[PDB]
Ligand binder design. Sequence first.
Ligand SMILES: CCCCCCCCCCCCCCCC(=O)O
Ligand SMILES: CCCCCCCCCCCCCCCC(=O)O
Length: 126
Amino acid sequence: SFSGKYQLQSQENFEAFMKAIGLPEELIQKGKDIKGVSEIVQNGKHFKFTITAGSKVIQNEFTVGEECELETMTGEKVKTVVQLEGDNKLVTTFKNIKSVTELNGDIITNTMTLGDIVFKRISKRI
Ligand SMILES: CCCCCCCCCCCCCCCC(=O)O
Ligand SMILES: CCCCCCCCCCCCCCCC(=O)O
């Protein structure tokens, strides 16, 4: 359902959000225009997802409904649960960030929001 390889097309408030969560500026300025590749492999409730941003690789894993440990952008790993809000939506909270991943056909739309910052990424199947 979710599986596939996707690249970012566009994103909103990368800089603002990454500062707020403590991404080191050095990595902000490099990664701000990288159109990153996300790779998803779903097997029923079981998901594995890789997020590559040049030379940075974040490999994560979770079963829906179950507790998981998600390595975040800074490197911090948080304990949380990811849930389906439908077949097309994946949904979670970590580090007070609300996260919504929406698949429509070939388009994955990810929104992360901390307080009033809404970090939105639009990715296309590749
Ligand atoms: C090792 C040097 C490479 C520098 C790369 C900078 C990393 C910037 C972060 C890219 C944004 C990707 C955030 C992932 C969000 C998500 O997976 O849902
Ligand atoms: C590195 C930040 C952790 C990712 C936060 C959400 C984890 C649960 C679901 C994974 C879906 C992420 C889809 C990536 C699409 C994208 O790169 O924008």
